[PDB]
Symmetry: D2
Subunit: 143 residues, 4 copies
Amino acid sequence: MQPRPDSAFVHDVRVTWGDCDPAKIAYTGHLPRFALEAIDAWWSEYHGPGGWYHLELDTNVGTPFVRLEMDFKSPVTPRHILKCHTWPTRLGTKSITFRVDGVQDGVTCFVGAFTCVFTIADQFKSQPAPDHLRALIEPHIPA
Amino acid sequence: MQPRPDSAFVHDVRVTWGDCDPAKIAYTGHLPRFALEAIDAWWSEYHGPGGWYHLELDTNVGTPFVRLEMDFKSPVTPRHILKCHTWPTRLGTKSITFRVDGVQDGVTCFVGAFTCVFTIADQFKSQPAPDHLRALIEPHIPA
Amino acid sequence: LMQPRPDSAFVHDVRVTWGDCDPAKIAYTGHLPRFALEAIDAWWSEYHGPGGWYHLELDTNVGTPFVRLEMDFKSPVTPRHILKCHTWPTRLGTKSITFRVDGVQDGVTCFVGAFTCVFTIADQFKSQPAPDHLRALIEPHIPA
Amino acid sequence: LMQPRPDSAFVHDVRVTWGDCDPAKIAYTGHLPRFALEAIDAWWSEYHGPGGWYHLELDTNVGTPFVRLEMDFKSPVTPRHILKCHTWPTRLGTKSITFRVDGVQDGVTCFVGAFTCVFTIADQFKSQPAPDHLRALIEPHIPA
Ligand SMILES: [Cl-]
Ligand SMILES: [Cl-]
């Protein structure tokens, strides 16, 4: 996958006891949730407070996921904050892909790529990526 | 219930789209999880990093829950940080009760009381509240 | 406070698994409310119609948001057995309903809960008294 | 990349409910991996023994931590139907196993996933090659 740019937005996730399975590490089932929380935080930072909730319910733009992939390189535990370095890697006319690197104490625990399309939210109908959103997103896509 | 002291530790919870049900508010099913995350953060702040995970796995003290109760006064949404004001309300010889007030933009959304006993973690056997923990906890119990 | 479960209680099976468990090797307390709520959702499916709260809210336009929950945890929940959630309405007033759920594994009562909801006109997010047609479905299941 | 599901695939039923859904009125993407993992856990219960991963890890001392997952989401998942998770091992090497899960609702394939685990000596959290006794259980279910 693409290496993380210096520019990446970081969303902190506090991992706890209850996120962990009997092997004493974060249950895999929760890791996509953490990544997606980071992407929502990304929208909050660069589009406006309330993340997807604001984007869907106020702006009438949905971004349903069509694909996700993650590689788990090292366990996630409550011993450190999970720093989720998050950035858009591409924006086509129909979809956007975000990268999330989940890092603990400088070790990359997981790397993920998450691809969404765009909808007119209240109609649940696909649309091309709106120009206003393209203007906000493209400055953060690395070379 | 008891009013929140000025002294209460606050743990911030970021509520998102995916925490919300089709009524556009946080699903009730997740609210106890948020409260419990705040209590774990409380242990991190006053006992040491890693919250319950550290307390159980390193200190060999478990704090299993025996009761929880919550009143939901106003909806929780992604529009604001959920500030979870958290404090111990009592510590007997066998159990501790924590209060959590979940507050958004100054409105109290929920009030909860959560009661745990103490175990020798590796034995899953009850014990009285250890003296060292009592010394850390009692300074934060309000009049 | 909490009433004993009647012979008539609806039982919803919940499969508990590895992923529900914490490092103490039992179901994390934070997941237990979810299981109890799933039971209540299944009660609605059984007595009101398939699709539980989703059907109730989106088709019938009746929401039942929670205003209180309380649970006592008596014994650990594990993946060694099905969690049998014995579920019934203990009370229906003019404005609210309270459901009891006992979570039982191999006949051991692991937790006892009481969960109180009010009623809304779903599409308006406005409170309403319990509608008469729902009252008619609910009341026959409230124990003595 | 992702192989079509065989007639032989184990099917695990997942009940999707209100609480799994987001404000767009479909299952939140973040919960879908959980459903797929539950399916894989059920596969282990079916072919290795009751209690899935919990039994595997805590009784048999074999862990199967995940090293990769990928999912394509083709159609929304809702509470209107049971989610039928068609589940099978697509591959077993010396060190890892890959499970496919197709989540199907009313015959529509809502998502297709592939999930890769390695094997550990559970109590040591140390990698090991796939044990021969598990290989013997797994291989008969790997399609052509
Ligand atoms: Cl905008
Ligand atoms: Cl200590």
